[PDB]
Structures are given as structure tokens and as C-alpha cells.
Amino acid sequence: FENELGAQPPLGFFDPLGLVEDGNQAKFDRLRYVELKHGRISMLAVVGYLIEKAGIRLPGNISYDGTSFADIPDGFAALSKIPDAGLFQLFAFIGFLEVFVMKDITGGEFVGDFRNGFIDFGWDSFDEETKLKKRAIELNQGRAAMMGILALMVHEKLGVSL
Amino acid sequence: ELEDGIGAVAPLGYFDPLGYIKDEETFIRYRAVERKHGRVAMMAMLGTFVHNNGWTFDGYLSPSQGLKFSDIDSGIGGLFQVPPAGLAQIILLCGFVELAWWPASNLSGDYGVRLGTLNDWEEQPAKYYRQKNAELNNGRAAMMGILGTFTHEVITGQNFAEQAAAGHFSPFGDGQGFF
Amino acid sequence: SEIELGATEPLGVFDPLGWLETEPEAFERRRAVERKHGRVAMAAVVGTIVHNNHIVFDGYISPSNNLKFSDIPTGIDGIFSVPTAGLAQIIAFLGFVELAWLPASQYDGDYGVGYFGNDILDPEEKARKLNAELNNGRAAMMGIMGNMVAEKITGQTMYEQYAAGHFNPFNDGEGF
Amino acid sequence: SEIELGVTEPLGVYDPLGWLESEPEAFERRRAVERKHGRVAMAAVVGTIVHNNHIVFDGYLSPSNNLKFSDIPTGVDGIRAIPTAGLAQILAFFALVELAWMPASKYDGDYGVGYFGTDIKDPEEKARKLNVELNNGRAAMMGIMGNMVAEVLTGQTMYEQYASGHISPF
Amino acid sequence: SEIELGVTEPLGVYDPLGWLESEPEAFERRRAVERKHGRVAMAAVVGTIVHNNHIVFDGYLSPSNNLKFSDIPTGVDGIRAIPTAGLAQILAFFALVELAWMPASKYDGDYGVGYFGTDIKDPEEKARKLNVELNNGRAAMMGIMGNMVAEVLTGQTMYEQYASGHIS
Numbered sequence: 001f002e003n004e005l006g007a008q009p010p011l012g013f014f015d016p017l018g019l020v021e022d023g024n025q026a027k028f029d030r031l032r033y034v035e036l037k038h039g040r041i042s043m044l045a046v047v048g049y050l051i052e053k054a055g056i057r058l059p060g061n062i063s064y065d066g067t068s069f070a071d072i073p074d075g076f077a078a079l080s081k082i083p084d085a086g087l088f089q090l091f092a093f094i095g096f097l098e099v100f101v102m103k104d105i106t107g108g109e110f111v112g113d114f115r116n117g118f119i120d121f122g123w124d125s126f127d128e129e130t131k132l133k134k135r136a137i138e139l140n141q142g143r144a145a146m147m148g149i150l151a152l153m154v155h156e157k158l159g160v161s162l
Numbered sequence: 163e164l165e166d167g168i169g170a171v172a173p174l175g176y177f178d179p180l181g182y183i184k185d186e187e188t189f190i191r192y193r194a195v196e197r198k199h200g201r202v203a204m205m206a207m208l209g210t211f212v213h214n215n216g217w218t219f220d221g222y223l224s225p226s227q228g229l230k231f232s233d234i235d236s237g238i239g240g241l242f243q244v245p246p247a248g249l250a251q252i253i254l255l256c257g258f259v260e261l262a263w264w265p266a267s268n269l270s271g272d273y274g275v276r277l278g279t280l281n282d283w284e285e286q287p288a289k290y291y292r293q294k295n296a297e298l299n300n301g302r303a304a305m306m307g308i309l310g311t312f313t314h315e316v317i318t319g320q321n322f323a324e325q326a327a328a329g330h331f332s333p334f335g336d337g338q339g340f341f
Numbered sequence: 342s343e344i345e346l347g348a349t350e351p352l353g354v355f356d357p358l359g360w361l362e363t364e365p366e367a368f369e370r371r372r373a374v375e376r377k378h379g380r381v382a383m384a385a386v387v388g389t390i391v392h393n394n395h396i397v398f399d400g401y402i403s404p405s406n407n408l409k410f411s412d413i414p415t416g417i418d419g420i421f422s423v424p425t426a427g428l429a430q431i432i433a434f435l436g437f438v439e440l441a442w443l444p445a446s447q448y449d450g451d452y453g454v455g456y457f458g459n460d461i462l463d464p465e466e467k468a469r470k471l472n473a474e475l476n477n478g479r480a481a482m483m484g485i486m487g488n489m490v491a492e493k494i495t496g497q498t499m500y501e502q503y504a505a506g507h508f509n510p511f512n513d514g515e516g517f
Numbered sequence: 518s519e520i521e522l523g524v525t526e527p528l529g530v531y532d533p534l535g536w537l538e539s540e541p542e543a544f545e546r547r548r549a550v551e552r553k554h555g556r557v558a559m560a561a562v563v564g565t566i567v568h569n570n571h572i573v574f575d576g577y578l579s580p581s582n583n584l585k586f587s588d589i590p591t592g593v594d595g596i597r598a599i600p601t602a603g604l605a606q607i608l609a610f611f612a613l614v615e616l617a618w619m620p621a622s623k624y625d626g627d628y629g630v631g632y633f634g635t636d637i638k639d640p641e642e643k644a645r646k647l648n649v650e651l652n653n654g655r656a657a658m659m660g661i662m663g664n665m666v667a668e669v670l671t672g673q674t675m676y677e678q679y680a681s682g683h684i685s686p687f
Numbered sequence: 688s689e690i691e692l693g694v695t696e697p698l699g700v701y702d703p704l705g706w707l708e709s710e711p712e713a714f715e716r717r718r719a720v721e722r723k724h725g726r727v728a729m730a731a732v733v734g735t736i737v738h739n740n741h742i743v744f745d746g747y748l749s750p751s752n753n754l755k756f757s758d759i760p761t762g763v764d765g766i767r768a769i770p771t772a773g774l775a776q777i778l779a780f781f782a783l784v785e786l787a788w789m790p791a792s793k794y795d796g797d798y799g800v801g802y803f804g805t806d807i808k809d810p811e812e813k814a815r816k817l818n819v820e821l822n823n824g825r826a827a828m829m830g831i832m833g834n835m836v837a838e839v840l841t842g843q844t845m846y847e848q849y850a851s852g853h854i855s
């Protein structure tokens with residue numbers, strides 16, 4: 001596991017702990033799957049935190065109930081003031097994504113390739129050099145975003161300005 | 163039947179420990195009795211389960227004697243609570259089954275009672291051996307249970323609802339027997 | 342056979358620790374443990390619905406102790422509120438069932454009784470209900486565990502919690 | 518088959534008119550009448566059980582006529598105390614049953630239903646239950662006829678003959 | 688096969704559009720729609736019977752919105768009395784039925800459950816009762832398509848259509 005997507009000009013195949021010092025491909029492609037699973041969530045979570053800290057909201061009225069978007073606080077307190085009828089809808093639809101439409105249904109050519117032949121914004125117009133660094137970008141962009149988003153939440157509960 | 167091994171179930175096998183089967187013709191007589199006694203004593207055990215639970219019919223068993231269903235004892239004396247004009251009806255119907263409909267002279271015990279898809283013995287013969295052994299085994303356990311139910315009322319004087327209300331499940335320290 | 346059942350459509354043969362390729366000699370006992378843990382949890386999940394719906398029998402489970410059946414709590418403390426002479430009668434009978442009647446050293450789980458008595462005549466209608474026992478058994482393992490940890494964390498039983506409407510863990514008083 | 522279906526144990530081929538050999542082809546018609554007279558009379562016996570046991574439908578059978586389910590009698594006068602618009606609904610719906618649905622021309626008896634949905638696969642068990650329907654059908658023809666002669670000579674229903682103590686005619 | 692399975696004696700094939708060999712390979716889906724539309728209409732018409740017989744569930748549908756089970760109307764607007772988390776729970780669960788467990792894409796109509804659990808071995812036993820699943824589905828399809836035009840044109844629901852003398 002010397003030369004693939006995590007191998008890296010500052011730190012090539014870091015691996016400090018006792019994870020993959022064997023030839024088990026199935027151990028690696030499970031761990032590679034979750035690393036971009038955590039990265040793709042945390043990339044939207046860095047942006048999803050900093051639009052709430054900047055105070056940007058949807059144009060109002062999250063419910064017919066008389067609660068607007070600006071009434072809902074930012075950070076961990078957003079979870080407590082979202083109406084519970086709508087907080088089921090967030091967990092049910094993300095569950096609807098994570099069960100049904102988020103998958104290697106048809107078989108991609110790598111791990112995390114969830115194009116089932118349904119949606120594709122190109123991926124043919126690359127020169128086979130640019131494909132594997134452009135998903136080495138989103139591995140490392142997803143790498144820094146999950147240490148980014150973990151910093152935003154350890155310091156919200158601490159109260160430290162960032 | 164001996165060759166299928168109908169009564170011989172897996173804890174004890176061919177449990178004839180005192181040596182009573184000395185040929186094949188006296189097994190068919192004994193199995194005809196054991197299966198018949200087991201069928202009677204199974205309905206006798208479901209009786210004592212229902213009687214001692216207080217589940218009675220509503221109304222009068224004998225309105226000309228004024229005897230309600232509620233004032234029949236749930237114990238060993240409850241059958242003879244019943245007027246003899248009434249249980250002559252029980253003996254005459256049960257005697258008519260024993261001679262005409264399910265003739266107890268039939269030593270095979272088959273009377274054609276088939277409840278079809280719950281016993282499709284022709285396509286699952288293992289279900290035949292399961293239901294044939296369980297008719298004997300539930301009949302043997304209920305034969306000893308009704309001998310249990312009978313003598314527990316005799317030696318204590320209380321029926322099963324009364325000796326379970328008192329917690330009287332030990333023949334030691336009570337005023338009954340020499341123990 | 343047995344090594345391909347337990348593997349249904351959304352994941353296939355699912356073993357992230359890889360003990361099928363690594364230790365195949367331990368699989369048929371581990372299937373027997375999975376099937377037994379399933380069948381125990383299925384009666385355990387069904388029991389929690391029946392207890393918390395206040396379906397009780399009547400009278401006293403222990404008249405010496407003056408302890409009714411409705412005096413039993415409907416949560417985790419219910420089997421431990423039963424007196425010790427009563428719990429010893431359960432475990433002695435359940436050990437009679439798990440060693441003599443349905444001996445759990447028999448690892449194919451097959452004890453003479455079929456599916457409602459019948460042997461499944463088809464081989465893959467048999468494999469479909471063999472997978473449905475495993476999948477409902479695996480779902481009930483998470484169901485009884487998800488009912489035990491969520492009682493001891495929220496402090497209330499399943500009737501108590503549902504009466505109170507304590508369903509949202511984000512706007513109550515809890516951790517996070 | 519079919520001709521060996523009314524022969525159980527005691528009297529066998531019991532026939533004191535010789536209509537065995539008198540007309541052998543007019544049997545498949547007469548057995549179909551025997552099976553339909555049995556199925557009618559069997560449901561009529563159990564009907565007189567449940568009527569005289571005072572199991573009622575908890576309502577009004579014709580609120581325009583102002584009679585409710587618990588005031589028409591549980592005896593012979595039951596379908597005399599039914600309005601003719603309701604009696605026209607009974608004979609028009611079973612007109613759809615007796616010819617359009619499972620008919621009476623179909624002398625096989627064998628419509629599509631079988632015994633509780635399913636076929637009996639043993640022929641000896643199937644021929645056993647076929648005698649049972651005939652036997653219980655034949656006993657209920659005597660049974661339901663002896664139930665309504667016994668109430669038109671008495672003047673009381675089944676329920677009042679029993680609750681009175683008026684059982685034995687002597 | 689799947690071609691014979693819907694024909695009975697008083698109409699036979701009965702194809703006034705003639706769509707049997709005019710587009711014949713679109714059968715295999717539009718039987719699967721008729722079986723689907725059948726099964727959802729007979730489950731909705733035996734539900735309309737039990738709604739108007741007042742068999743309701745003893746309790747509260749939503750205590751947060753103060754909705755008893757007797758609060759809901761027993762008619763066409765009874766589906767609208769469901770709250771917003773109520774029918775979010777309906778299509779979240781039945782998305783796991785219609786795609787995953789009982790995939791409505793599967794045009795066989797055969798999801799391994801049989802008729803009360805058994806697979807009907809006799810081929811004209813089971814050809815008979817798939818004629819029944821279609822025929823009772825067809826008669827239920829204008830069963831409550833004639834019930835909802837029977838409420839929206841007189842206003843009342845079935846329980847007060849019958850407790851009025853308003854049948855004829």
C-alpha cells in the first residue's frame with residue numbers, strides 16, 4: 001500500500017498505527033471507503049458550519065408553525081430548535097440516501113465511485129493522469145475538512161473564538 | 163409398531179426395563195391400551211387445567227336440581243357432583259363412540275382422523291414419526307399427571323386450586339401423613 | 342448448504358473481519374451462535390412489546406412475597422424483581438429445554454420441528470425462510486440491545502418514555 | 518370415484534327402492550341434489566343453533582320498517598319477519614351465486630374451493646371427507662326437518678322448548 | 688403463464704382496445720400494474736369498511752398535535768388529518784417496501800410470501816387463485832373509485848351516507 005491515493009509528497013504512506021502491514025486488500029478498501037465517507041460529509045460540514053456562523057439563512061419560515069430560519073441558532077443549538085417533525089425528515093431522507101441511492105450499484109472503477117451510469121459530469125475527458133490526482137485532491141480535501149470540522153465543535157463547546 | 167420404533171423416543175430408547183415384551187403380539191395389545199389411556203388422560207389433564215382455573219360456563223348444568231356450573235368442585239369430586247341423569251348422557255355418548263364411531267376394539271388406533279396439510283405424511287415422513295411419538299409422549303406424561311392430580315387431592319384433602327393457594331407443595335411439617 | 346444463507350441482497354456475504362476466509366472451521370458454531378442469539382432476541386423483543394403494553398396475567402407471581410404480576414416493572418428491572426426461588430425455576434426449566442428438548446450443542450439448529458411443523462419442500466423456499474429467520478434474528482439483536490441501552494440512558498422504560506413523548510434526543514436534557 | 522360415496526359402514530348401499538338399478542344414469546343428478554340438500558340443511562342447523570343462542574347482530578336490519586336484529590323470532594317465523602325489499606336482496610344475490618357464480622348445473626359439486634381452500638392429496642382421505650359431507654348433510658336434513666316439525670307442533674321455539682323444561686313429549 | 692391469468696368465463700379476454708398484439712411486450716408491465724393497482728385498491732376498500740365501522744385505535748395518533756384516533760374523519764379527508772411527521776413516516780417506510788423488500792419494479796408480483804405462506808403446488812389451484820387476486824382486485828378498483836365519487840358528490844362519508852336513508 002505504498003503508491004496509491006493516500007501516498008503523498010509531504011508524507012508518503014504515513015501509517016503510524018498497526019493497520020495495514022499485510023496484503024489484505026479487503027481491509028484497505030473498507031478503510032479507504034470510510035475515509036472518503038467521513039471526508040465527503042465533513043467537507044459539507046465545514047461549509048455547513050461557516051454559513052450559520054456568518055448568519056446566512058434560508059428566506060424564512062421553516063414551518064407553518066411560526067418558526068423562521070433566523071430563529072434557529074447556529075452550531076450545536078440548531079439541533080434543539082429545529083422542529084421535530086422536520087428533524088425526522090432529515091434523518092429519513094439521509095437514511096433514504098444511505099440505504100438506496102448512494103452506492104456501488106453497478107460497479108465503479110474505484111472505491112467511492114457512486115456514478116451508477118445515472119449521473120456523470122464528465123469523467124471521460126481526463127488524461128488518466130488527472131483522474132487519480134483529482135480524486136487524490138478530494139481525499140486530501142476531505143482529509144483536512146474532518147480535522148477542520150472537529151476543530152469547530154471542540155471549540156464551540158469550549159467557547160474559543162476561531 | 164415395533165419396527166418403526168414408535169414409542170421408543172430418544173431419552174430412553176426402547177424403554178421396556180422390566181422385560182414385558184416377550185413377543186410381537188403382546189406389544190400390539192399394550193400399545194393399543196397405552197395410546198387409548200394416553201388419549202383419555204390428556205383430556206383429563208386439560209380438564210383439571212380448565213376446572214382449577216375457575217373457567218366455567220354461565221348458567222345451570224341442571225336447572226331442575228338448581229345446580230349451577232359454578233358450584234361444581236374443580237377437584238376429584240366434581241364429576242359426581244353432576245346428576246346421574248346427566249352423566250348417563252355422558253356415558254351413553256362416549257359409549258357410542260367406543261363401539262361405533264371410534265371402536266376401541268381397533269387395536270391400531272387409526273380412526274381416519276386426518277387434518278390434511280398439518281399432517282402430509284406422504285411427503286414428509288419425519289412429521290409422521292414426530293406426531294406419532296408426541297401422541298404417546300404427551301399421553302404418557304398426562305397419564306402420570308392425572309395420577310399426580312388424583313393422589314395430591316387424596317393425601318391433602320385440597321384440590322389443585324386450593325393447595326396452590328396455600329402453597330402446600332411439601333409433605334414435611336404439615337399435619338398430614340407421618341412426615 | 343449453510344455457508345451461503347445469512348447472505349441476502351443489499352450486501353451479499355458480509356464479513357468485514359474476514360473470518361470466513363481466515364477461520365472456516367469455526368463458522369458452523371458461529372452460525373449456531375448467530376441463530377441462537379437471533380431466536381433469543383426475537384422472543385426478547387416481542388416480550389418488551391407485550392410487557393410495555395401492560396398485558397399481565399392476573400394475581401400474584403409470589404403470594405408469600407406479596408408480589409403481583411403487575412408489580413413487575415416492564416423494563417430491565419423486571420426479570421430481577423422476580424424472587425430468587427422464582428428465577429431458579431425459570432433457569433432450571435430453560436436449561437432443561439436447552440440441553441434435552443432443544444439441545445443447543447446441535448449446531449444446525451434443527452430439532453425435529455419444522456417451520457410450523459412442516460419441512461419446507463422447496464430447497465430455496467427453504468433458504469428464503471432460513472434467511473428470514475436470520476435477518477429477523479439479526480434485526481432483533483439490535484432491537485433488544487437498542488431497547489436496553491435506551492432505557493438505562495433515558496432512565497425510563499418504554500412505556501414511561503413513550504407516555505412522556507421523550508423521543509427527540511436533541512432538545513431534551515441529555516448529553517449533547 | 519363418485520358412486521362409492523354414500524357407503525359408510527352400517528347399511529352400506531342402503532336403498533329400499535332399487536333406484537340403483539332402475540335408472541343408473543339418473544344418479545349424478547340425484548347425488549348433486551343430495552349434496553346441495555345437505556349443504557343447505559347443514560347451514561340451516563347451525564343457523565338454528567346460533568339464532569336460539571341469542572347471538573344477535575347489534576343493530577337494525579331495516580330502520581325504515583323500525584325492526585331491529587333482536588326482535589325477529591329465532592324459530593320458523595324468521596324469514597317471515599323480514600321485509601320484502603330485504604328478501605329481494607337475498608334472492609337476487611344468491612341468483613348470482615346459483616347460476617353466475619358456483620352453480621347448481623355443475624353436478625360435480627367441485628367448483629374451485631376444495632376443503633378449506635386446498636385439495637386433499639390422499640384420495641382415501643379425500644373420499645373419507647366426501648362421505649362426511651354426505652353423512653353430516655344427510656343427518657342435518659333429518660336434523661333441520663325435525664327442528665321445525667318440533668316447533669310447529671309445540672308452539673315454542675328451540676329456545677323456549679329448552680328453557681321451559683318441555684323436552685319429553687309424554 | 689401470465690397471459691391466461693386474468694381471463695374468466697363471462698368476459699373472456701375482453702380487449703376493446705386490442706392491446707394484446709398491438710404492443711404485446713408491454714403486457715408484462717401492465718399486468719404488473721393491474722396486479723399492483725388491484726392489491727392497493729382491495730387493501731383500501733376493506734380499510735374503508737373498517738374506518739366507517741368505528742374500530743379506532745383506543746388512543747392518540749399525535750399527542751403533540753392532540754390528535755386522537757377518533758379525531759380523524761372516516762372518509763376522503765381522513766388521509767389529510769395525518770400530521771406532517773405522520774406521512775413522512777409513511778413514505779419513509781414504504782420506500783423500504785417498494786424498492787427494497789417488495790420491489791414494485793419486479794413485474795412478477797412474486798415476492799416469496801405465497802398465499803398465506805405456502806406455495807400452491809397444484810398448477811390449476813394456483814392459476815385459479817391468481818384469477819381471484821386479479822378479479823377481486825378489478826372489482827375493488829371500482830370498489831372505492833365508486834366510493835370517493837360517492838363522497839365528494841354528496842359531502843357525507845359512508846357512515847352517514849348509510850345512517851341517512853341516502854342509499855337510493
Ligand code: CLA
Pocket residue numbers: 164167168169170171174175176177178179182183189192193195196199200301302303305306
Ligand atoms: C396405559 C398403560 C400403559 C401401557 C399398557 C404401556 C405399554 C407400553 N409402554 Mg408405556 N408408559 C406409560 C403407560 C403405558 N405403557 C406411562 C404412564 C409412561 C410414563 C412413565 C410410559 C413410558 C414409556 C416409555 C418411555 C416407553 C414405554 C414403552 C411401552 C411399551 C413397552 C412394554 C412395557 O413396558 O409395558 C409396561 C407393562 C405393563 C403395562 C404391565 C404392568 C402393569 C403394572 C404392574 C401396573 C401397575 C402400575 C402402577 C399401579 C402405577 C404405575 C405408576 C407408578 C410408577 C407411579 C408398551 C407398549 C416403550 C415403547 O413404547 O417402545 C417402543 C418405551 O420406550 N412406556
Ligand code: CLA
Pocket residue numbers: 520521522523524528529530531532533534536537544547548550551554655656658659662
Ligand atoms: C332429498 C335429498 C336426497 C337425494 C336427492 C338423495 C339421493 C340419493 N341417496 Mg340419499 N338420503 C337422504 C337425502 C337424499 N338422498 C336423507 C335425508 C337420508 C336419511 C338420512 C338419506 C339416506 C341414504 C342412504 C343410507 C343412502 C342414500 C343413497 C342415495 C342415492 C341412491 C338413490 C336413493 O335411494 O335416493 C332416495 C330417493 C329420493 C331421495 C327421492 C325422493 C324419495 C321420497 C319422495 C322422499 C320423501 C320421503 C319422506 C316423505 C321424507 C320424510 C323425511 C322425514 C321428514 C321423515 C341417491 C343419490 C345411497 C347412496 O348414497 O349410494 C351411494 C345410500 O346408500 N340415501
Ligand SMILES: CC(=O)O[C@H]1CC(C)(C)C(=C=C/C(C)=C/C=C/C(C)=C/C=C/C=C(C)/C=C/C=C(\C)C(=O)C[C@@]23O[C@]2(C)C[C@@H](O)CC3(C)C)[C@](C)(O)C1
Pocket residue numbers: 500501502503504505506723726727730731746747748749750777781784785789
Ligand atoms: C407514552 C404512551 O402512553 O404511549 C403512547 C406512545 C405514542 C407513540 C405517542 C402513541 C402513538 C402514535 C403512533 C405510534 C401512530 C402510528 C400509526 C401507524 C403505524 C400508521 C400506519 C400507517 C400505514 C398506512 C395507512 C398504509 C398505506 C398503504 C397502502 C395504500 C399500500 O398500498 C401498501 C402496500 O402494502 C400493500 C398494501 C399493497 C402493495 O401492492 C403495495 C404496497 C406494498 C405499497 C400512543 C398511541 O399515543 C401511545
Ligand SMILES: CC(=O)O[C@H]1CC(C)(C)C(=C=C/C(C)=C/C=C/C(C)=C/C=C/C=C(C)/C=C/C=C(\C)C(=O)C[C@@]23O[C@]2(C)C[C@@H](O)CC3(C)C)[C@](C)(O)C1
Pocket residue numbers: 198201202205221222223224225252256257259260264676677678679680681682
Ligand atoms: C331455556 C334455557 O334456559 O336453556 C337451557 C337449556 C338446558 C339444556 C336446560 C341447559 C343445560 C345443560 C347442558 C346442555 C349440560 C351439558 C354440557 C356438556 C357439553 C356436557 C358434556 C359432557 C362430556 C364429558 C364430560 C366427556 C367425557 C369424555 C371422556 C372422559 C373421554 O375420555 C372421551 C373419548 O373421546 C376420547 C377423549 C378418547 C377416545 O379414545 C374415546 C372416548 C370416547 C372415551 C341450560 C344451559 O341450562 C340452558
Ligand SMILES: CC(=O)O[C@H]1CC(C)(C)C(=C=C/C(C)=C/C=C/C(C)=C/C=C/C=C(C)/C=C/C=C(\C)C(=O)C[C@@]23O[C@]2(C)C[C@@H](O)CC3(C)C)[C@](C)(O)C1
Pocket residue numbers: 701702703704724727728731734735762763764765766767828829831832835
Ligand atoms: C365499457 C367497456 O368496454 O369497458 C372496458 C373499456 C376500458 C375502460 C377501456 C377498460 C379499462 C381500464 C379501467 C377500467 C381502468 C380503471 C382502473 C381503476 C379504477 C384503478 C383504481 C385505482 C384506486 C386505487 C389504486 C386506491 C386509492 C385509494 C387509497 C390508496 C386509499 O388509501 C383510500 C382512502 O380512503 C382512505 C383509506 C385513506 C385516505 O387518506 C386516502 C383515501 C381517501 C383515498 C376495460 C378493462 O377493457 C373495460
Ligand code: KC1
Pocket residue numbers: 329331402403404405406423424425426427428430431432434435
Ligand atoms: C412442577 C410444578 C410446579 C409447582 C408445584 C410450582 C410451585 C410454585 N412456583 Mg413454580 N414454576 C414451574 C413449576 C412449578 N411451580 C414451572 C414449570 C415454571 C416455568 C419455568 C415455574 C416458574 C415460576 C416462577 C417465576 C415463580 C414460580 C413460583 C412458584 C411458587 C408460588 C408460591 C409462592 O411463591 O408463595 C410455588 C411453590 C414463584 C416463586 O417461587 O416465588 C418465591 C415464582 O416467582 N414458578
Ligand code: KC1
Pocket residue numbers: 578579580581582599600601602603604606607608610611854
Ligand atoms: C353492498 C350493497 C348493499 C347496500 C347499499 C344495501 C342496502 C340496504 N339493505 Mg342490504 N343486502 C346486501 C347488500 C346491500 N344492501 C347483501 C349483499 C345482502 C345479502 C344477500 C343484503 C341483505 C339484506 C336484508 C335481509 C335486508 C337488507 C336491507 C337493506 C336496506 C337497509 C335500510 C332500509 O331498510 O331501506 C338498505 C337499502 C333491509 C331492507 O331491505 O329493508 C327494507 C333488509 O331487511 N339487505
